[PDB]
Design a protein around this ligand. Structure first.
Ligand SMILES: Nc1ncnc2c1ncn2[C@@H]1O[C@H](CSCC[C@H](N)C(=O)O)[C@@H](O)[C@H]1O
Ligand SMILES: Nc1ncnc2c1ncn2[C@@H]1O[C@H](CSCC[C@H](N)C(=O)O)[C@@H](O)[C@H]1O
Ligand SMILES: [Zn+2]
Ligand SMILES: [Zn+2]
Ligand SMILES: [Zn+2]
Ligand SMILES: [Zn+2]
Ligand SMILES: [Zn+2]
Ligand SMILES: [Zn+2]
Lengths: 151, 430, 434
């Protein structure tokens, strides 16, 4: 109990649907930093370590790619390492990635190896990831429905 | 805003060339030529950052020395000079009528082969030799912090350097370490080529623990192989280099293996609260695109240095050397035992037609004549140029096809010996 | 008595009605002019004249091309054991041992030759207890005429010695020069007649051009020798390409490369001195053992010498026997291995490499592909190992940026350092040393 509100470092807002579903979920946000209420920061190429140190911490990361996938994914990973908690910390942490199943198999092997986590698949299908307790807007609502347990 | 009126304006003894783009014409410049006096626009200096160190298959410079472009290029035929000029560049600056002058003047001498003055407006710099290297080393992207100075660990407490290596090749890193005298208490490798393992095993008495491919090393392997004290690494320089029209960038192709150096760099680097030294190293070809010189140094969070082998060897080798080695930005001093000239590496009763050999690719003019007969270089002479011991690749029945390809993607021994010199302040030598 | 089947003689020796030395061991004919060097028996005129030629013939995969007894290729049966390659044919096995044994022997897997097996009277094929010492003498004496023993030159005074003015006709890769330099004999001049441009590079870069070259041998006249003379030693060796019986379209002497023998003879006649002399003079020659006996007779008649036979396997780790003519002091001493001889294949390999055989013979798949095994994958010999096998100092042929085939071909047709060292050892007694 006694849970502070959420702060999500989203990415690839696009239509900014994720914020809409999060608001409809019945929980409030503390600070949202999006990049294509939403406090825009920069382009994807202009975020430094001291920036995340100053505005940290964070509790959510979002992927998304409906072209070179590595261009976006490796910056995503870069940040993901930036936002992840250091040693001696017990703060809850989340992450999540979205990618179409129509993709290279070697690509898939590489991303699975780099994220050090086995992937999951949800039919429409879209390749899915994420260290989150739980097992297309309806898909978004279904996925972040159980987010209210620890918040 | 053509260069025609710009040259006339500065010819009136009332204006300078640094207010405009010498190779581009437009005003609003950012920086200057390191070869002459003037300035360039922002989008026009980027192309000079890449193409300066290119060379053609004919042993001569690839593109223009003024504008770095040309449909046709007049070529200088002096002694070991490769600069090729542009057709329209000459008449804009030095004066009109030079098209038919150099055509009939055989041999032609370019403006860096003769004592030059303000011929037209071609004011060659008095000390362009020293200011050219600063055009490639000291740029300003984000001004990262100075390298952390690990405390100088004295003797009687230094462990043998537990080296790690990715894409080892022919154990170039191991060879230099034994030359310095640093005891290699453990040396993992990451080579996959069949012939490369043969060279590193028989020559080194089986002291190298060749293990496996890079894409199979998992998180658990490092803690059962470590702790490590250095992480060497050299990426495959064929993904995005300005020689293959494929143009497979860092984010698409075998350039993906750069992050695999960064990936394994995170596991090996010490956890928070520990106070032990941990050095690392990286290098790639200088002739890469614009959007990679800083991205690789952004993820690494460091400032690249540049070292050229022409000051310590008889070949043209200059690459970007990342890392935080102790005292790495110091100037490139030559060695007394260096084979500074080609004639110190040739066989008996052979003489050369050049002084410094230009770059060599998968396909090897002819730089040697013996007994008054025209010949080419031998595979046992390339080893002396790169500082390797003689009869080093004579293993596993390779002729000239493999002893040349395998030697064309290795590091210069006296160049690497420069960086690793201060490592004796942290590890037990001899 | 002569043209009958082998059954009569087999029964006669079975019924104690005759002796082993009465009939030919390979055809049954009478008149034992010689003795079989491996068993008890006799040879006729038309049998031993094809046993001096085809005994040292080997196949392309390291085996014997003809059976050990009849030397006729009708049907073969190979000794499966390694370190031995001698094989017996069908008729040579069935008649002289026992009927019905061929099928059982073929079904007997693995099979062993009777020489590998312990000696017993398996039929009438009794094995001589001193076969080797008699086989060695089978190839050197009892043939041809009895030429007068060469006269030894008088003992040269120790002080009055001069550097040797060699003329190494058909030098190759300066094998004789390498032996002389290693032996410790002062060379004051060294001529050479080679037309192999790659070999010129090897002889030039390695020995600092100390040897004065000459172009093709076919363009040398008397005046050249008059200018270059005197000559304290003449050396030569014919290219054993067309002389050997390996090629079906063999020409032998008097044709092709055989004619070069006449060039060597003329060059030796020109360079040898005149009457009323005291200058020491020595010469030498070499050709393969496997050649026609008639050509060997003509060569031995022209030169007036009885050739000796030296087999490299007694000091080296290879199969190589070749004839030696010449005049040197003591060409038929018993050979002894040196204290630094690489006698077995194990001493001529790389690191992390293991040798399975012990002495290598001179379709390259699954049979010759397995001389050396590394990490469970058997492979072939390297050039750096051939250089060690042949006795040359290591890293010798690696010039002119040539790879595997050129190096091995250039290495396969040369001499061996220990054999020529043994031959040239007594030469320190006439010329200046060190
Ligand atoms: N996936 C992979 N795993 C291990 N090695 C690889 C590899 N992909 C390429 N390599 C090898 O890595 C080498 C990089 S070239 C670098 C040579 C070496 N680092 C030196 O400077 O001496 C290439 O020759 C290639 O054969
Ligand atoms: N027509 C010719 N004239 C002169 N030399 C010849 C020749 N044909 C072949 N040769 C040389 O004769 C040599 C035969 S190899 C035999 C030479 C010596 N036993 C050694 O190898 O050390 C070859 O090296 C070849 O270069
Ligand atoms: Zn410009
Ligand atoms: Zn130009
Ligand atoms: Zn020039
Ligand atoms: Zn007979
Ligand atoms: Zn037979
Ligand atoms: Zn046998």
């Amino acid at each position: 109990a006694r849970r502070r509100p959420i702060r999500v470092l989203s990415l690839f807002d696009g239509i900014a649907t994720g914020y809409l579903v999060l608001k409809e979920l019945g929980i409030k946000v503390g600070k949202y930093v999006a990049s294509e209420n939403i406090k825009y920061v920069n382009d994807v190429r202009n975020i430094t370590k001291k920036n995340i140190e100053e505005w940290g911490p964070f509790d959510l990361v979002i992927g998304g790619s409906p072209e070179g996938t590595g261009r976006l994914f490796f910056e995503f990973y870069h940040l993901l390492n930036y936002s992840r908690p250091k040693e001696g910390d017990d703060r809850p942490f989340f992450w999540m990635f979205e990618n179409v199943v129509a993709m290279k198999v070697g690509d898939k092997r590489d991303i699975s190896r780099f994220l050090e986590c086995n992937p999951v698949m949800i039919d429409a299908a879209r390749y899915f990831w994420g260290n989150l307790p739980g097992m297309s807007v309806p898909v978004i609502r279904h996925l972040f429905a159980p987010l209210k347990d620890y918040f």
